[model samples]
Each structure stands twice: as structure tokens, then as C-alpha cells.
Target chain A: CPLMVKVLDAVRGSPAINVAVHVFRKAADDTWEPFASGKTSESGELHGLTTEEEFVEGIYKVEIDTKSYWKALGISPFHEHAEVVFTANDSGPRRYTIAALLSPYSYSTTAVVTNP
Target chain B: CPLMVKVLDAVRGSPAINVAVHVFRKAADDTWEPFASGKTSESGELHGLTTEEEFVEGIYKVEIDTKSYWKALGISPFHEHAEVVFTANDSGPRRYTIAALLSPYSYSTTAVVTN
Candidate 1:
């Protein structure tokens, strides 16, 4: 897989299971076109968002729906959603991992990229 | 006094220095009101963004200018900016530490809230 996501719950100190993730590629028209979507597994990880050949070189956006997850846990979250956007394969094809830490009032998005 | 920020350069594996940060509080009319601003120090930290009394109970936004920082390092970043927006002091007064990790192509924002 060219892209993967890992989400951790800081408050509970566990994996954030079943979180929703949406991937988008920036279209030439300067708009975001949906590319893929999935929900995190029990390990709080989602893989296979895109394949290396299909990912190509482009600007991509990843949106994590955090509010509903928090709501389900009886906690009120602040961010409507958490978004991570970046340019992929600008220099060369690479494997990317988006990591996030979530709390009721705080969240984080980080990426680890390696040569494929 | 109540709010702080810590920024790291994921690519460099070091502290992100001199990155500008702006803070805003959500107003009653549903608009952001500028509250305070500062830049990360050599330690990748910004302290005293607002006082405990002034921080109060409300929604707050912290905007980190990652693009400019990455550009200064001769790299292009993906997000125009990294933003941390959340409600503060809903139950009681607490200290907040907004932590951000930045890369040329990606970044992360996490918060540490404590009483």
C-alpha cells in the first residue's frame, strides 16, 4: 500500500478504533476529488488507502472524523474534524503513514514517509 | 499563563524554532477574535499565550504557520497552516499545551490538557 493511517487515543491511551477516514486528491480544477475512504480497524490502523501505482504524484488530503467518535464515547470534542494535507511523490514515490493522537479537547496529525 | 505551544520539525528531528503562532478565541457572534500571538523559541516552545484569568471558558484556535517555516528551510509544505481548534475550560480552568510536528509533506497537531 502507498498510504496508511494510524490513530491513537491520547486520553484513553489506546488505539482509536473504527474512526472514519476520507482521502482526496486535488483535481486540476483546484478542487478536492474524493479518491478513497475507510474506517480504522481494531488496531486503530487503516491500510490500502491507495496503491503506489494509483497514488501517483499529487496533492492529497486526509480528513479524520473525530467529533462523532468522541460523541460516541460520551466526550465532547472541539474540532469538527482533523485534516492532513500534503503533496505526495513530488520528488519520488514514497510510502506514507498518517499518525494521529486524539483527545476530547485536542488532537494531532503527523506523517511518516519512507522510500517505497 | 494558561496556554502554551510546542512545535517540532519531524524531518529534522529537532525543535522547530521561530515558527509564528496566532491564537484566537471564538466570540459570541461566531467569529474569531484575536487573542495573542507568539513564536516558538529555540526549544520549540511558546509560553504565556494567554493568562489563566483571560483564557476563560470558550473555544480557541491556534494557527501554526508551517508553510512559511518550511519555505525558509527550502522545502514546500502541504498544508497552508496547521490549526488546533477546541473548547477550553468547559468544566474548569486548565493548562493547555498545543504540540505540532511538521514535515515537508505532512504535519501533526496534538494537545496536552491538564488541570
Candidate 2:
């Protein structure tokens, strides 16, 4: 099992396709360093960010590039970006799904860690 | 303009109808005190929680009852609830919209403060 993320529209209840999702690592200087990134598919999902086999306990941040997404949709963004932070632990070989709920003016994010 | 919230399904991009939404104010003791509550309409929205005509600046939290929603759909919730915390300022007579995105196994929330 690997880590995954799903990005969707709050209004249409459909996948927010092509939204850029960035993953960051907290650096010693307290600045987030971009580690990896991807775009959501037709289903509004991005998978295999990190594998359970490579999991480690640490603080991570997922930043959604809402500005670009809204711009593409011809909507002005109220907030330029939306971010979510959480800690991951070595519970076992489980798939962790981080879901991001996005709207033109607002957004929300949550995660679920489970064994596949 | 007043403070309003919209609840919707992330996957469907549609308003999450009949969802229970709760608002809380941060008390002096740092605990959340329930202030007001409402349910989503057919459009999956609730309005007039706080009016721009009478705005107050403070810390507030919005909690969405996801457990009950997922149960209604017969889907197991990965998380029991979803919450969003933001500070409201008197930016003028304008509307503020807080939108919550919800899924059976995941959720996300964000707010827009504008004038």
C-alpha cells in the first residue's frame, strides 16, 4: 500500500482534474522544501506518493495549488492556496489516503490510514 | 452580507444536502462554545449564520458531522468529523463564505473572508 490523495470539487461533487498537488518536507530552516508533486486524474485522484514500505514518522504538508486551478476554471480564488499538515506514524503496512475538498472560495482536507 | 457556509461532496461536486453544520466560538478558557447550528438546503448551503451588518472579529470554528452523513449513505467514515478554524475580522459589509468538502473516507475545509 502507498500514500494517496484525492482532489475534488465541493460544488459538483466531481473530481477536480488536473489540479497540482505538492508534497513538502519540513526543513531545518523551518521552510517547506518541495519533495514531490503530481496532478489529479480524471477521477480527481493522485496515488503512490509514498509507499508504506518507505513510511517514516514525521510531519508533512500537502499544499494544493488552488490559484492555478481556479484560474484555469475562469474563477477568481479567494485564497491563493490551501494547505494541510499532519503527522504520520509507523503503525504498519497500510495505505494512507489524504483527501482534499476544494471549492472556488473555500476548501477542506482530511486523511484516512488503513491496511489494504 | 453575512457569514455563510456551504457544504458539498468533493467527488460529486454537488451540495451535500441535509448535512448538519455547527458553529462555535472560542471561549476565554480556550474551549469551543457552541454558538449556532443549521442544516444544508437542497443546494447544500446554509446562510445568515452571522450578518455582515453586525460583524464581530474573533476566533471561530465550524464543525461538520461527517459520521452521521456517511452512515446515512451506508459508508464507513475514515474520520468521525471535519473541522475548520479561522479568524473573522470586520472587513466591512461583505459576505464571507466557508466551504467544506466532504467524502466518505476523506474531507477538507477552507474559508474566504472578503469585503
Candidate 3:
């Protein structure tokens, strides 16, 4: 897999398990086309979203739905959806890891990119 | 200052300098009342956003405008504004630091609370 997402719960100070994630690629016509979707495991991570071959260069969006995740914990999150948009493979093929920390009303999303 | 912010640039891997930040405390009726605003320094930080005496216990909103920051570099950003909204000083007075990482198309906003 060329891309992966890891999430952490700032409130619980643990992995955000069972969080749903959807990956989308922006079409040339300015529309979002679904590329992959899945749920995070016990490690608060979802893997195999896309392969190096198919994860071609373009703009991508990572949508992590926290509404259900917070609902399961008996809390309401302020943001309906946590979204991340970025361009990939501009220079060349590389690995990417999105690290997210979630709180009830606030969250942080960061990316760790590998040097080619 | 009871509240502070630190911003990092993912594209350059350095402190995000001169980024604008605004803070608002929610009014009793749900309206956002502006409290304070400023720009980041060379270290990508803005100090004295609020004092413990005035921060109070309520919902607070932190707005970081990335459009101007990116535009200065000749890059257009995706989001018009990056905002973080959360409850503060619920149990009692505590210090808070918001750490942010920015990219042309993406960014991350997180809080570090002291115990």
C-alpha cells in the first residue's frame, strides 16, 4: 500500500478504533470519485487503501467520519466530517502516513511523507 | 497567556511564520464574540492570546487563515479558513497549546492540554 491513515484519541489517549475512512480522488471535471473506503483496526489505522500503481499522481481527499466514533462514546463532535485534501506524486512516487489526534470538539491532522 | 498556538509548515518543514490567528469566545446566546487576534512570529507561534483571568470557561474558536499565508508564497490553498472549536476550562483553569501543521492542500490542528 502506498498510503495509510493512523488515528489517535486525544481524550482517551489511545488509538481511535473502528473509525470509518473514505478515500477519494478528484476528477478532472472537478468532482470527487471514490477510490477506496474502510474502517480502522484496533491500531487506529486503515491500510491497503490503494496500491502504488493505481494511486497515480493527482489531488486526493481523505475523509474520516468521526460522528459515529464519537457517538459510540456518548459524545457529539463539533465537525460533521473530518476531511483532508492534498496533491500527491507531484515530484515522484512516495509513501504517506496521515497521523490524526481526535478530541470531542477538536482534532489534528498531519502528514508524514517519505523522501524519494 | 493561558492560550498559545504553534504552527508548522509541512511543505517547508519549518515554523510557519506570520500566519494570522483570531480567537473568539462564544457568547451565552451562541454568537461568536471576538476576543483577540494576532499573527505568528518567526517561530510560528503567537503568545498571550488570552490570560487565565479572561479566558474563562466556555466554548472557544481559533481561526487560522491559510489562504493569505499560502498566497504570499504564490500557492493557492484548498480551504478558505482552518478553524478549531472546542470547550475550554471545563473543570478548572488549565493551560492549552494548539499545534498546527500546514500544507498547500491540507493541514492538521491539534491541542495539547496540561494536567
Candidate 4:
């Protein structure tokens, strides 16, 4: 699998927006730790999981808190927490891109993991 | 949660892009069906799971194929199959946004499941 990153300023043109991402690596003991963190770009978009360190073949989790972003927009949404889990079956020089959208009330996210 | 939709053309300067969304309702039989379907917006983004019907409290899956999009760009990346699973705990006016990014090689996705 490839390592890549990209952030979308989903809630742009609205109020102030803030998003937090937490990367956790699952261990044999079934626990996780802070693998990496990133702040969305000005347009609420940014990229690169390369800094999350070398890829591992196992289950991984990505958590995002959109509640604050919505609150800042002066709008309310149904969901506050967004989570995505995926795997990198094997390791290599792979390219990965993760993007998400945030509005005052809701948001959507997608990933593009490909070979380089 | 509320209901909403928006599309962003991450590859505006690229070629054709396609996104497939499958909504399934878990049956006691442990099988899934095409609860609904939608085509992405011109910008490679679209919204409104409202047609997904009333949200249910359970596990769900979303699969996206970026292989074609990448090949169209003459670029290759590490992964081909991108899948995202989430829950809609209860039924109400909930808003959900499921978005992803694409390029010659890598991408990422995030969700805003709010009430």
C-alpha cells in the first residue's frame, strides 16, 4: 500500500473551522496509540500519511472531531465524531490520499490508496 | 443529524471520474442489498444519503474504486480498493457526509456524522 495525505477545506466560506485527526496502530494486545496528527489546510484540505511513519499490515483507525468545526460555523450537525478504519496488507512505496468534507451540520470523506 | 451533499473536483484538470455508493440494510440472514444508489457530482462529489432511506442503528459499508480514475490520469498508487464503514445509531433528521480524495497515486477520506 502507499502512504499519502490530503485535506479538504470542506466548511470553507463559512465560519472558523477546526479539525483533529488521530492515527492509531493496533498492537497484538489490541491497543492503540497516537501514530500521528495533522491540521487541515486553509481550504480545510491537506495531505500525506508518509509522516505517520512506515506502513504496517494490520487494522488502522482514523478519528476526526467535526463538532467543533460545525460549532464554529454557527450551525449544528447530526454527527460530531467521524471515524475511518483501513489496512495496508503489505508494505512498499505506495501512495495514499485521504480527504473529507465538513459543513455546519454534516460532512463526507473519501480515500485514494494506489500504487506509485 | 441533518441531511446534506456537496461535490469537489479534486482532479478538475484530469479525466473522467466515477464514484459508486451502495447502501445496505443488515438482515437477520446476514446479507446486504442495494438499499439505494447515486452517481457523484460533476466535480467528483455529491451528497444526500436521504435517499438511503431512514437511517438505522447498525454497521454499514462504503466501497470506492479509484483504480480507473488513477489509470485515467496515467498515475499509479499503492491501493486500489478504498472502503469506509460507519454507523447511524438512531433514526432522526441526521446529516452525513462521506467524502474521499483522488490523485495519480494516494488519497484519504473522512466523515461528518452529526446530529
Candidate 5:
């Protein structure tokens, strides 16, 4: 299973579509490497961001290119990107889903669902 | 002197225009009374929300009807309204201004200027 992410407009709770998404994992060298990259769907979700090879106990980060997203909406971007960092422990659940609530100036993230 | 308010889109930092604005003052009866009602301008500002007639040392609140604003943009309203409550003291500045940052799902307010 893959870790899913749902992007939502922070104030209206509407699905944020066509937003660029990139997932990175912290490597042994203490540097970040790209794990997955894609755009959000009409439903505001990025599918298959996680794979068996990349699924391990470690620190991972998701970067949302908010600037482009707002530009496409004909608005000036207030933020360059919104990042979410999380830890996946070996003893934890096998599958995870995260939700990102975002506005221009602020954002909040949460692990909404998990399955072992 | 009067108080002004500016409305902006939270993510885009763009001026929010034509949004309905209402200001209320808390009265001694513990009820909120309407102080000012108006709409944001093309620059995303609401002017003259406070006047000598209603400006005093006490609690005041501003309500933004976000639902109607979003509807005008063809987006669904995630929030019905956004409200801001602040205090005014006699010893404080006679002129004040506030800024409201808003998005479909979130909002934040701040006292931006005073004189």
C-alpha cells in the first residue's frame, strides 16, 4: 500500500486540484532524495507516493508547490511551498494517509488514517 | 477618526473584493449591536468602520460573510463566516486599521496600523 495525501483549501475545505506534489526521504548521507513526484488529482489526492522499496522506517517529507498552484488560479502566491515532515517507524502501521489543510499564509497536516 | 479593514486572499495575498463586512460593538447589555455594515472595495478594503459615534473603549467585532463571497467565485463555501474580536481603549490611538487574511478554509486577522 502507498501513503496517500489529500490536499484541501484550508478555509473552504474544498479539494485543491492540480497542485504539484513531491515526496522526499532522508538518505543516510543526511540529504534528501526524491522518492515520488506528481500532481494532485481532481479529488485533491496524490496516489502511490509510497512503494515497498521506499517504505521504510525513516523521516520523509512532502513538498507542495503552492506558488504554481496559486499562479494557475490567477492569484499571486503568498508562499513558495508548504512542506510536511513525518516519521514512519518500523513498529508502526503498514499504511498511512495524510491530509494537508492549506491557505496562503498557513497550513496544518495530520495523519488521518492508518492500517496495519 | 475612523477604523479601516483590509481583506486578502490567504494563499494568494490578493485583495478580496466585494465581500460583505459587518462590524459590531459589545454593549453593556452583553449583546452585540451592529456598528457598521458595508462591502470591501476593489482594493479589498472596507473604510470607515468606526466613527466618533461608535468608537469607544470596549470590545468590538467584525464579521465577514465568506460564504457569499465564495459563491460569487463559483467555489463552495467551506466556512460560513469569519469573525474578529478586538478591544479599544480610550488611552489608545484614535485611529486604527485591521487586516483580514482569508481562504476558503481558513482566516487570520491582525491590527495592521494605528495613528
Candidate 6:
């Protein structure tokens, strides 16, 4: 089975569709173990990522949901997809968040998740 | 001086840097009230946006943060920004969430905020 990491992402305005995100882990064989998934909120927040406490050590990846999110907005996205990949060796206690801001021109970043 | 709507978004993986989101409201002058902002998480989730109970009765917009998100990943983002515009008349109780999925080739969507 799979675990679900739930979150409430709140935004103030409206955003387009044509974007999606996924969680994946690196196995001993140098592959990846996809766990959870989510999308951005209308108010500019990505509020969903299930199956916490499972992302093991090694390397991780976060891909930008650029296409679908744009298509939903009725605009043609330029890039096929955008991705963010990081490395983590400790699994003791830590919360991670991958944030982005996308437009026909620019984007932003941040980390909103923490574990103790 | 701005009202900040606070929230906690959690993800599981690591995504690129090259995406940004902004919130704007249609004002009486027919302009937009660009208020709060946010970014995406590693596990394929966005987690920020503020200034609630203020979005007036009109059209609202949500833009995707793809540039910085991908730049952080050290990869060149293909598209510029992904946006979503919706209509609202009665601001009773509603939470709006703009969800996305991005890779070197794909993406997804959803509404996670409920007021």
C-alpha cells in the first residue's frame, strides 16, 4: 500500500492549470521510488503530498507541473517540464517543501515544511 | 502594510527551481490587487499564498512559478508562467488551492484550499 501526506495550501487569487508535481526516492539500484503527488492552490499554494516518513536517504526529485497547469490556464507553455532535484542522507527528522512561482515571464522558490 | 494569510504546505521529493506564483484581485478601478505569493515543494506540491477574506467579487488569477524553480534545478525552463483565472461573487467560505505537477515533460492540477 501507500501513505498519504495531506496539507492545506491557501492562496488569495486564481491560477491556471497544466501543472503537476511528484515525489520520488533513489533506491540502492540507483532508481527512484515514487511516493506521493500534489498540485498548486488557486491562491498560489501547493497543498498536497501524501505518504510522509518514507522518503529514504540518497537523492530526491521535484518536477514542476508546467504543461498541464498552463494548459488549464488556456495558455501554451514553453517548456515541456521543470524539475528540482536534491540530496539527503539523514532520515532522523526533517520536513521538506519545494515551492515555485511561474508565469509567462518568471518564477520564485521556498521551503515550507519542517520536522522535529 | 499588507494582510498575510498564513499556511503550512508539506511535500516529499525534490523539484527544480524556476517557478513563482502571485495572487491578484480585480479592484474597483478595474486593476488587480497583487497581494500574497508562494513556491512549490519537493514532493510535487505548492505551499504558500496570503491575504484572505479580501479577494473582491470579480475575476481572480493564479500564476505558476516555473523559472526560479527550474533555474534552481540548473535546467532551462521551457515555458514562461502557467496561470488560472476564476470568478467569484459571494465570498462566504471558500479556500482555493492551485496544484501542479512539473517534470522535464509533464504536469497536473487540483484545488486544495476550502473556505
Highest lDDT: which candidate? 1
lDDT score for residue B38 of model 1: 95
lDDT of 3 at A87: 75
Clashing pairs in 5: A10-B105, A10-B106, A11-B104, A11-B105, A11-B106, A12-B104, A12-B105, A104-B10, A104-B11
lDDT of 6 by residue, B1-115 (tens): 1111222222224443324667676677867678556544444444445433555456665656554555666665433444455454353335554555554223333434444
Stretches off by above 4 angstroms in model 2 are A1-112, B52-55
Candidate 4 lDDT by residue in tens digits, A27-110: 889777667666565555444544434665766667666655555556655454465555554565445566665554344556
True contacts kept of 1: 0.41
Ranking by TM-score: 1, 3, 5, 2, 4, 6
- For residues A8-83, could you state the per-residue lDDT of candidate 5 as single tens digits? 8775467889989998989999999888888889999888876756688888898988878877877664678888
TM-score of each: 0.66, 0.54, 0.60, 0.46, 0.58, 0.40
The lowest-lDDT stretch of 10 consecutive residues in candidate 1 chain A is A103-112
Residues B20-102, candidate 2: write the lDDT tens digits: 88988888988778877888899988986766444567777777777687778777665545666666655533567877778
User: What's each prediction's clash count?
Assistant: 3, 18, 1, 61, 9, 105
RMSD of each: 4.7, 8.1, 7.0, 8.2, 6.0, 16.2
Best by DockQ: 5
List ranges where model 1 is wrong by over 4 Å.
B1-63, B74-80, B85-115
The lDDT per prediction is 0.84, 0.72, 0.82, 0.54, 0.80, 0.48
lDDT of 3: 0.82
2 or 6, greater by lDDT: 2
**For model 3, what is the alpha-carbon lDDT of residue B66?**
82
**Candidates 5 and 6 compared by lDDT, better number:** 5
Error of 5 at B46 (Å): 1.2
Candidate 2 TM-score, true structure as reference:
0.54
Per-residue error (Å), model 2, residue B107: 2.3
**Model 3, residue B71: what's the lDDT?**
91
Q: Where does model 4 exceed 4 Å of error? A: A1-4, A9-17, A47-53, A89-91, B1-115
True contacts kept of 6: 0.00
DockQ, all candidates in order: 0.31, 0.20, 0.17, 0.11, 0.43, 0.03
lDDT of 3 by residue, A52-115 (tens): 8998988887888876799888986655457666778887897888777887657777777786
